[PDB]
Design a protein around this ligand. Structure first.
Ligand SMILES: [Zn+2]
Ligand SMILES: [Zn+2]
Ligand SMILES: [Zn+2]
Ligand SMILES: [Zn+2]
Lengths: 225, 214
C-alpha cells in the first residue's frame, strides 16, 4: 500500500536549524509530487509548498517563501523540510502529503503521520505536583472531586494515572496550558463517592519522560495550615 | 490568494442525521474543490475531489456539490465514526488554500455542570505561588462562562482554562480554570470565588472559600 512515514518529534530552541523527513513506499516515488502542510496547535491546515521529485522543482506559498526549504532525495524516496534558523512561531505539526492529480486538480491522497515540532527557549524541566482537594467542610454532596495540579514542566507530555492505574472511571485529564513562563501546567481530576474521602486513599502518578522524572502525590487536605 | 471560508465553524449532530457543511471561495474556483476529514492527533483523509467526486474507499454517505464560489459537503445518516473536523481545499490555482475547518460534534441533552473549587496547596504556597482551581464537571453544551472573584472583585488576565473533548460515555465536556497569584497577593485577600454561567443553570452558580476558614 501507499505509505508516507515521517521522522520523529522534535524539540528545539530558537536559532537552531532543523531538517525533517518524509519517506515514501509502496509506489514510484519520482512520479508523484509531495506537498508540505503546517498545522499550528489548535489551528487548521496551511499549505506550505511542494516539490516534484523527478526534477527537483519547488514552489512555495507566499508566506513561506524564503522561510523554509523543501527538498528531495529520490534514490531513497525521501522528501525533506528544513529551516536554517527556527523561531518559536514555527511550533506546529508538519505533514507531508502525496499529490494525486485527479478530476483535473491536485489532491492529497496519502498523508504522513505528521511530525510535531516544538520550538521554545525553555529548558527541560520535570513537573511539580500539588493536590487538588476540597476545603474541609465544603463537601455537601454524595460525590466529591479530587485531583492533582501538574505544574511548571517542559516539554509536553506528561502522563497521569490514579492509584497506580486501578482508578480509571470518572478521570478527566485536561489539555495542558502554556504559561507565560514558557512552562506547561495541567490538571487531572476524578470524581469519587463523598463517603470514601475518609476511608480510601487517592494518589496521582505523574510521569514525565523528557526529564526522566516520576512524582506520586497522595491527595488530601490537612486540617491546619 | 483565494480565501476559503467554511460555515458553520462547528455543529452538533446525532447519529442518523443529514449533516451539511458549506464552503465559500473568495473568487471562482470552478469545480476544483476537495474535502478532507481529520480526527484529533491523526492525519487528514481525502473524501471528495473536483467538488463531487468520491475518493476510492470512502463511504457513499459522503457527497459533495457546488461549483464556482459555493460548495457543500453532505453526510447522509451520520455515523459514529464521522464525528471529526472537515476541511475544504481549493486546487484551482496556487497557492493551494484550505478553509478553516468545521467541527462535527455529538448532540445530546443539556446537562448542568457540577462545580468545585480547590484552594492552593500548602506545598505550593511554600514555594511562593498560589494556584486556585475551579472545575466544571460533565456539562453540555460546551458554552460556559467562568468568572473569578477575589474579595468580590472580578479578576482579569490572571487565569487560564482548558476543556476536554467530549466524554466517550456521556458526550459531555469538563472544564478546568486556574487562577494564579503570588503567595503575597494570595495572603492579602479573604474571599476566593468561581462563578459559573451555563445554559443548564437557572442562575449562575458560585463556589467559594475564605482563606483561614478552609
Ligand atoms: Zn517537474
Ligand atoms: Zn466527570
Ligand atoms: Zn483583597
Ligand atoms: Zn483547611
Amino acid at each position: 500500500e501507499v505509505q508516507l512515514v515521517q521522522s520523529g518529534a522534535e524539540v528545539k530552541k530558537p536559532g537552531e536549524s532543523l531538517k525533517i523527513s518524509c519517506k515514501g513506499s509502496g509506489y514510484s516515488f519520482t512520479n508523484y509530487w509531495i506537498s508540505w502542510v503546517r498545522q499550528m496547535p489548535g489551528k487548521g491546515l496551511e499549505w506550505m509548498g511542494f516539490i516534484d521529485p523527478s526534477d527537483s522543482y519547488t514552489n512555495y506559498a507566499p508566506s513561506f517563501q524564503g522561510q523554509v526549504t523543501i527538498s528531495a532525495d529520490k534514490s531513497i524516496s525521501t522528501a525533506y523540510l528544513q529551516w536554517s534558523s527556527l523561531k518559536a512561531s514555527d511550533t506546529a505539526m508538519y505533514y507531508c502529503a502525496r499529490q494525486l492529480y485527479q478530476g483535473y486538480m491536485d489532491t492529497f491522497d496519502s498523508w504522513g503521520q505528521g511530525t510535531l515540532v516544538t520550538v521554545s527557549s525553555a529548558s527541560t524541566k520535570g513537573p511539580s505536583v500539588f493536590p487538588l482537594a476540597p476545603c474541609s467542610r465544603s463537601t455537601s454532596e454524595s460525590t466529591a472531586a479530587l485531583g492533582c495540579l501538574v505544574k511548571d514542566y517542559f516539554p509536553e507530555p506528561v502522563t497521569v494515572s490514579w492509584n497506580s492505574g486501578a482508578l480509571t472511571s470518572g478521570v478527566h485529564t485536561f489539555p495542558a496550558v502554556l504559561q507565560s513562563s514558557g512552562l506547561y501546567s495541567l490538571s487531572s481530576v476524578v470524581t469519587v463517592p463523598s463517603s470514601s474521602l475518609g476511608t480510601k486513599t487517592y494518589t496521582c502518578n505523574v510521569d514525565h519522560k523528557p526529564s526522566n522524572t516520576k512524582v506520586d502525590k497522595r491527595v488530601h487536605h490537612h486540617h491546619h495550615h | 490568494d483565494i480565501q476559503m471560508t467554511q460555515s458553520p465553524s462547528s455543529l452538533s449532530a446525532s447519529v442518523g442525521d443529514r449533516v451539511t457543511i458549506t464552503c465559500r471561495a473568495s473568487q471562482s474556483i470552478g469545480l476544483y474543490l476537495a474535502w478532507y476529514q481529520q480526527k484529533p492527533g491523526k492525519a487528514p483523509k481525502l473524501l471528495i475531489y473536483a467538488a463531487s467526486s468520491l475518493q476510492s474507499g470512502v463511504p457513499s454517505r459522503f457527497s459533495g456539490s457546488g461549483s464556482g464560489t459555493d460548495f457543500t459537503l453532505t453526510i447522509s445518516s451520520l455515523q459514529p465514526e464521522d464525528f471529526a473536523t472537515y476541511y475544504c481545499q481549493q486546487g484551482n490555482t496556487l497557492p493551494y488554500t484550505f478553509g478553516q475547518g468545521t467541527k462535527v460534534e455529538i448532540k445530546r441533552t443539556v446537562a448542568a455542570p457540577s462545580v468545585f473549587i480547590f484552594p492552593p496547596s500548602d506545598e505550593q504556597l511554600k514555594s511562593g505561588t498560589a494556584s486556585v482551581v475551579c472545575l466544571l464537571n460533565n456539562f453540555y453544551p460546551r458554552e460556559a462562562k467562568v468568572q473569578w472573584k477575589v474579595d468580590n472583585a472580578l479578576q482579569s488576565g490572571n487565569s487560564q482554562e482548558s476543556v476536554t473533548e467530549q466524554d466517550s460515555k456521556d458526550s459531555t465536556y469538563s472544564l478546568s480554570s486556574t487562577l494564579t497569584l503570588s503567595k503575597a497577593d494570595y495572603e492579602k485577600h479573604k474571599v476566593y470565588a468561581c462563578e459559573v454561567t451555563h445554559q443548564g443553570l437557572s442562575s449562575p452558580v458560585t463556589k467559594s472559600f475564605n482563606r483561614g476558614e478552609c
